Amino acid sequence: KVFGRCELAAAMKRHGLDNYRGYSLGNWVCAAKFESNFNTQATNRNTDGSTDYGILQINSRWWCNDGRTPGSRNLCNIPCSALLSSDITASVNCAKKIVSDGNGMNAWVAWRNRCKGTDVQAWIRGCRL
């Protein structure tokens, strides 16, 4: 599924991401825009052989099992394909664990490089929430 901007914001808010560990909702929408272009089916391979999955591009080296990243961990205890669903619950629940591990949203390279320090509230402007 390709979410609309305000449709994704509404879904992330219902699932508790607004101000989760201090990050306002616009941070999460901005991150999703630049990680996946709001597309739950996005995948991208990394140089070390691991793969990033879903609307927030969660990495199989640490967080999910895809059967093909040897020596990796599965800290969200899920198959990576669960992160490609049109239902974003799995992705949100796993992102909560990631952002909690001490590094905040710096875990997401596109957030650090394209969202951090910008007016991220513009990403939820005009939406009815």
Name the features:
allergen, Lysozyme, three-stranded antiparallel beta sheet, mainly alpha, 129 residues, 3 strands, beta-N-acetylglucosaminidase activity
Count of the domains: 1
Instruction: Output the helix-strand order.
Output: HHEEEHH
What fold name stands as the CATH topology?
Lysozyme
From the N-terminal CA to the C-terminal CA, the straight-line distance is 21 Å
Counting DSSP H or I runs of 4 or more residues, the number of helices is: 4
Strand arrangement within the widest β-sheet reads: 1-2-3
Can you tell me the CATH class?
Answer: Mainly Alpha
The helicity comes to 25-40%
What is the CA-based Rg, rounded?
Answer: 14 Å
Tell me the β content.
5-15%
- Gross geometry: globular
* CATH 2nd-level architecture: Orthogonal Bundle
> Could you tell me the number of beta strands?
3
Structural class by SSE content? mainly alpha
Biggest β-sheet strands, sense, barrel:
3 strands, antiparallel
Q: What is the topological layout?
A:
Layout: H1 5-14, H2 25-36, E1 43-45, E2 51-53, E3 58-59, H3 89-99, H4 109-114
Helix pairs in contact: 1-2
